[PDB]
Design a protein around this nucleic acid. Structure first.
Length: 1129
DNA sequence: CTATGAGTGGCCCCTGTGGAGAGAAGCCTGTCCTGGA
DNA sequence: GGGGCCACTCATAG
RNA sequence: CAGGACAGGCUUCUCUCCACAGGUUUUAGAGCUAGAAAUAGCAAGUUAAAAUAAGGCUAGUCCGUUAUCAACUUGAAAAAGUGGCACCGAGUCGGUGCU
């Protein structure tokens, strides 16, 4: 008799519950054969348990690190390009300068050349350090002077500029002379008054520079400026111009009464284009007004930058840096004077102690600028003469460094201008610089487009670029080697969907006109109308649909029921009264793309042309695919023969985003084999059948369904891993699902390969059920109908939670891990009971108090970073990992705290003592993650290298993390690492104590009827003696397996101390005790007033000769190996 | 007399921002359709 | 949250 | 009862590519004076170079932290295969009967 049995499953983020029950809600138990070298040949176990595992993580970190690696590599490549350019002339003056540059990081003992890099002689080095305290001094001096300087200084300046070229946000050119806010505001007002003499603006008395440079929001600046302008509004034309000058996006529809919105934003690249067409609409006389607005905006954002006001040079940033340096020097002198004058004792603290947050700590230590201000602020409060210094502190301007985090707002055009000025001044003495000025400018301004991607030769699983040729990609010949249009199309396509019914065809663009026609006819197909004299609703004819679309859909961007009734039935068909069903208020789809094309091209018959279908659809596809404008113009240049410049540029501007859910070949590509119509043709005219898309794809009359069946290529059965990975969700739930399916497979294998009756458990859960059904039921009957021998049940946790709360079967997650198993068991029981109580309740209570539950910790091989990322200074300790091959850690410091890959057991002989005496040993040597490949290649050589000799190969036992060892008195420990252990034993409590603890913990939070609440409170009051029993049992369990003498003593003392506390507080504090006894690593926990630190087992010597256990994924099959007999002499 | 292991307790760990796209999922208003029961 | 490392102290064997 | 397309909104999340600002580490930026030295006073401090997971070959202006993995037999791996049942009890499972 194949016993009828049910399987219950609970899938969480960390756990997978499993349980097997009979037809009688009873859990069978079986005796299992045990392999190994031990004597315990067979053990009886229950068929219930749960699996715990570490939660999975997303791929975000890997992608971030890859991006960082590419950034670093490309920056170094640019530096190498500059060195290559300077290579010819550098050797003619200083051959070893480049060697000195890179070899700088080595100590003086290691350097092949002289220690001073810049000159190689200390005198010139000191002279350089004196004449130019900061690199900004050199930059400004080269910008302003006309003298011929040494090649090395120019090289240094150019390298500094390139390596920190700054951000690329704003396109176009920036005028550095555009910095005066007031003068440009006056010019804008003057131009407005000249062009609007009937409405002049009196800008006198308005401080434009203060308002526009204020650290307020753009709307606040606009409001403040307008409030000072009588008669003007932010909604007015001048208000919109100011908003644009602030960097907002005003709408110019109202001031020119245009039929179309004219929205301008200076950050958008459309400013030139939209300005051009706006002038084409309102007249070209308004060019200088927008020019003045642009100049004012430029002055604004360059005024927020560049604190310097009136100093005249081509390098304002260098002037700002020098000004800050001078202020820092003067303030430092004054501060030293004052501190020495009044508080000499703290002078040492301020200027000598590195560890404190004073000036010495701010400079030579790790104290940040905010920390330094925080430390110095109370001290300055105690002294006098620091009023302006206090103001500067409030301004984040006191003693400011040059390299600060606010530098993130520097446009690259400033560095470009400085480069251009330096090259202009010095190219007369340096012909090769003048010749390669173009190359230097390109290198400074070059940027890889976002749509191109990595420049690989196919050997990267991330690269998609298509090459025109096979030259080495250089910044000067990038455009001549890469098909930018094809690359962009590939970038778009690989992220697009595939059609469900036709997986071999791309889906159409969302705003494709053919798609819009399809949708409109699809909705019109199911529109019914009832007029006077009509007994039943009738479907609209094809000519009726065509007339309706031409009259309303092509003319109105939205058509409503009332509009249709007034415009077509009442006017065209002369039906005065009509009742329309299937559309309530308005029609859903619309011909927006048709309206846009009729607005741009301004030709209706050209759009109405059926033969231009290919050209029109190709134009729509081109507008959807590409976002860069040059590529769009490149593609549109084929169709320019039919359009003027205005139409082409307006077409150049229309972008469309989104995609449809269906393919063109499905709708209008496949023709009916009988009639020749496509789906669109049938929607246009289907006779009295009037079949919609759903009806057409399911009708057996046409061959479209036959093509659907044929086009279903027999996709090779997706592997369970791949099938789950293809689902929608985070990888963690995917891992949980995979482990659950493996658990189900093992449970099936256990029961003698007899299939179960019922499997008890959002679209992801639906996919899980689908996977289970597919793997379990594969039998097809004589009619090719799947014989569902197994029932799949979907139930929500709310039902089982109610089941628990109704029958006092409380769940306390803080006691142990059995709650997952009990929840799975109750899930299965409730599902079977509902779909299919004195006996049942007794059986359930018997099941709950059962002591043996299979709890298994999943064994894993840890991977990830080689070590921590913080780099530590050199120290005399062997635990420091070198950052590179030829860098002694005691000379340079480096990494620390590597992570163990996995542990291995080694039994061999090791020399010990100064006499070099061979000693037979038995210890654990853990492999670091960085060593994993080397060890896997040849363990023998690796073990020989670490002082282990006479290798005993057959004793190598793979010991991953959480490998379980068994010791005396049932005490269990898990191998946390190569040198640390965790708790391995679980505490079991009688169910009555769990119920009492739950009732006490929610004593004041009772959610039930008043009589039930009072009864529960009385029950809590009656059984106070349980607390002593609970404490005694905890002490006994800790004594037997935990060995926590001092911590237990402190716990006992605290319990005796707080024995007078209220019952709720006592229970709440006692609940915190299980952190000492819970599975996993010990953790510190708080008990009333005293905090108890974590007791950490750092000794792996006791388990060297214990019994090792290997366990199946469900823990039913197991093999036991004793370490004592292993490695015997 | 000093090197060597074995525990107690304490302290540490890379951060911030922008631009570009595609998809998915969940909720809501609603209309229509396919399949079986 | 959780494993590594280090200062400190102590017991032990050469 | 399940499934689907559309019209619109809202919200969140995932995945991929291109850039910036730092941080950390070592070296360079003659420390002076009195004192044998311990030490005491004095001066000064803002910056620069290189590296940022060891490295690898398929040598790319590429890849290197996602995912998967109890034990034994076969297989290079993928992958395939390998373990008796019924009854009475329960402090981590125990006992009885058949085979």
């Amino acid at each position: 008799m194949d016993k009828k049995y049910s399987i219950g499953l609970d899938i969480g983020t960390n756990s997978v519950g499993w349980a097997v029950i009979t037809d009688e809600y009873k859990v069978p138990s079986k005796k299992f054969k045990v392999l190994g070298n031990t004597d315990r040949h067979s053990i009886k176990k229950n068929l219930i348990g749960a699996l715990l595992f570490d939660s999975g993580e997303t791929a975000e970190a890997t992608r971030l690190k890859r991006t960082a690696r590419r950034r670093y590599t490309r920056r170094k490549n640019r530096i190498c390009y500059l060195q290559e350019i300077f290579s010819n002339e550098m050797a003619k003056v200083d051959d070893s300068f480049f060697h000195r540059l890179e070899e700088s990081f080595l100590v003086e003992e290691d350097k092949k050349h002289e220690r001073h890099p810049i000159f190689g002689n200390i005198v010139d080095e000191v002279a350089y350090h004196e004449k130019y305290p900061t690199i900004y001094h050199l930059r400004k001096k080269l910008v302003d002077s006309t003298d011929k300087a040494d090649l090395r200084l120019i090289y240094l300046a150019l390298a500094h500029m390139i390596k920190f070229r700054g951000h690329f946000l704003i396109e176009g050119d920036l005028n550095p002379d555009n910095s005066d806010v007031d003068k440009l505001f006056i010019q804008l007002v003057q131009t407005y008054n000249q062009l609007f003499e009937e409405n002049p603006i009196n800008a006198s008395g308005v401080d434009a520079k203060a308002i526009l440079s204020a650290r307020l929001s753009k709307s606040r600046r606009l409001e403040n400026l307008i409030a000072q302008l009588p008669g003007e509004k932010k909604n007015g034309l001048f208000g919109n111009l100011i908003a644009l000058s602030l960097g907002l996006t005003p709408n110019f529809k109202s001031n020119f009464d245009l039929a179309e919105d004219a929205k301008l934003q200076l950050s958008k690249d459309t400013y030139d284009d939209d300005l051009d067409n706006l002038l084409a609409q309102i007249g070209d006389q308004y060019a200088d007004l927008f020019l003045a607005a642009k100049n004012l905006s430029d002055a604004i954002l360059l005024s927020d930058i560049l604190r310097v006001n009136t100093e005249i040079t081509k390098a304002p940033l260098s002037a700002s840096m020098i000004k800050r340096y001078d202020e820092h020097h003067q303030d430092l002198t004054l501060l030293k004077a004052l501190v020495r004058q009044q508080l000499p004792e703290k002078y040492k603290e301020i200027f000598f102690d590195q560890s404190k947050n004073g000036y010495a700590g701010y400079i030579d230590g790790g104290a940040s600028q905010e920390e330094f201000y925080k430390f110095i602020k109370p001290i300055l409060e105690k002294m006098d003469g620091t009023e302006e210094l206090l103001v500067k502190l409030n301004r984040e301007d006191l003693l400011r460094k040059q390299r600060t985090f606010d530098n993130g707002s520097i446009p690259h055009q400033i560095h470009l201008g400085e480069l251009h000025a330096i090259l202009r001044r010095q190219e007369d003495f340096y012909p090769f610089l003048k010749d390669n000025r173009e190359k230097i400018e390109k290198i400074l301004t070059f940027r890889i487009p976002y749509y191109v991607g990595p420049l690989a030769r196919g050997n990267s699983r991330f690269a998609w670029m298509t090459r025109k040729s096979e030259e080495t990609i250089t910044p000067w010949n990038f455009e001549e080697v890469v098909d930018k249009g094809a690359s962009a199309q590939s970038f778009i396509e690989r992220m697009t969907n595939f059609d469900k019914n036709l997986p071999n065809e791309k889906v159409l663009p969302k705003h494709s006109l053919l798609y819009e026609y399809f949708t409109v006819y699809n909705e019109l197909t199911k529109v019914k109308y009832v007029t006077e004299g009509m007994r039943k609703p009738a479907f609209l004819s094809g000519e009726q649909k065509k007339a309706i679309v031409d009259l309303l859909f092509k003319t109105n961007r939205k058509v409503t029921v009332k509009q249709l009734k007034e415009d077509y039935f009442k006017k065209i068909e002369c039906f005065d009264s009509v009742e329309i069903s299937g559309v309530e208020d308005r029609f859903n789809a619309s011909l927006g793309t048709y309206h846009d094309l009729l607005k741009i091209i301004k030709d209706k018959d050209f759009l109405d042309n059926e033969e231009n279908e290919d050209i029109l659809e190709d134009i729509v596809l081109t507008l959807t695919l590409f976002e860069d404008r040059e590529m769009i113009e490149e593609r549109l240049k084929t169709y320019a023969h039919l359009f003027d410049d205005k139409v082409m540029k307006q077409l150049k501007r229309r972008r469309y985003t989104g995609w449809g859910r269906l393919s063109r070949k499905l709708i209008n590509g496949i023709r009916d084999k009988q009639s020749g119509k496509t789906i669109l043709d049938f929607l246009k005219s289907d006779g009295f059948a009037n079949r919609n898309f759903m009806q057409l794809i399911h009708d057996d009359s046409l061959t479209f369904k036959e093509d659907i069946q044929k086009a279903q290529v027999s996709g090779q059965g997706d592997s369970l891993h791949e099938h789950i990975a293809n689902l929608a969700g985070s990888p963690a739930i995917k891992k949980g699902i995979l482990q659950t399916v493996k658990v189900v497979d093992e449970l099936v294998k256990v029961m003698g390969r007899h299939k179960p009756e019922n499997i008890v458990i959002r679209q992801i859960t639906k996919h899980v059920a689908q996977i289970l059904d597919s793997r379990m039921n594969t039998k097809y009957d004589e009619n090719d109908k799947l014989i569902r021998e197994v029932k799949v049940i979907t139930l929500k946790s709310k039902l089982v939670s109610d089941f628990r709360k109704d029958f006092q079967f409380y769940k306390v997650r803080e006691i142990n891990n059995y709650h997952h198993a009990h929840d799975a068991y109750l899930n299965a029981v409730v599902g079977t009971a509902l779909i299919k109580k004195g006996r049942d309740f007794a059986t359930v209570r018997k099941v709950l108090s059962m002591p043996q539950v299979n709890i298994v910790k999943k064994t894993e091989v840890q991977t990830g970073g080689f070590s921590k990322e913080s780099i530590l200074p050199k120290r005399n300790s062997d635990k420091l990992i070198a950052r590179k091959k030829d860098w002694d850690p005691k000379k340079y410091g480096g990494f620390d705290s590597p992570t163990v890959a996995y542990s291995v057991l080694v039994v061999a002989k090791v020399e010990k003592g100064k006499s070099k005496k061979l000693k037979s040993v038995k210890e654990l040597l853990g492999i670091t993650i960085m060593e994993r490949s080397s060890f896997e290649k040849n363990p023998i050589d690796f073990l020989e290298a670490k002082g282990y000799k006479e290798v005993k190969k057959d004793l190598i036992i793979k010991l991953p993390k959480y490998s379980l060892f068994e010791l005396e008195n049932g005490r269990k420990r898990m191998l946390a690492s190569a040198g640390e252990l965790q708790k391995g034993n679980e505490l079991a409590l009688p169910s009555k104590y769990v119920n009492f603890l739950y009732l006490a913990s929610h004593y004041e939070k009772l959610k039930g009827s008043p009589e039930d609440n009072e009864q529960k409170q009385l029950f809590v009051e009656q059984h106070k003696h349980y607390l002593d029993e609970i404490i005694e049992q905890i002490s006994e369990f800790s004594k037997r397996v935990i060995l926590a003498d001092a911590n237990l003593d402190k716990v006992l003392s605290a319990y005796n101390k707080h024995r007078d506390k209220p019952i709720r507080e006592q229970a709440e504090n006692i609940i915190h005790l299980f952190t000492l006894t819970n599975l996993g690593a010990p953790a510190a926990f708080k008990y009333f007033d005293t905090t108890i630190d974590r007791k950490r087992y750092t000794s792996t010597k006791e388990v060297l000769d214990a019994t090792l256990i290997h366990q199946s994924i469900t823990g039913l099959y197991e093999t036991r190996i004793d370490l004592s007999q292993l490695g015997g002499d």
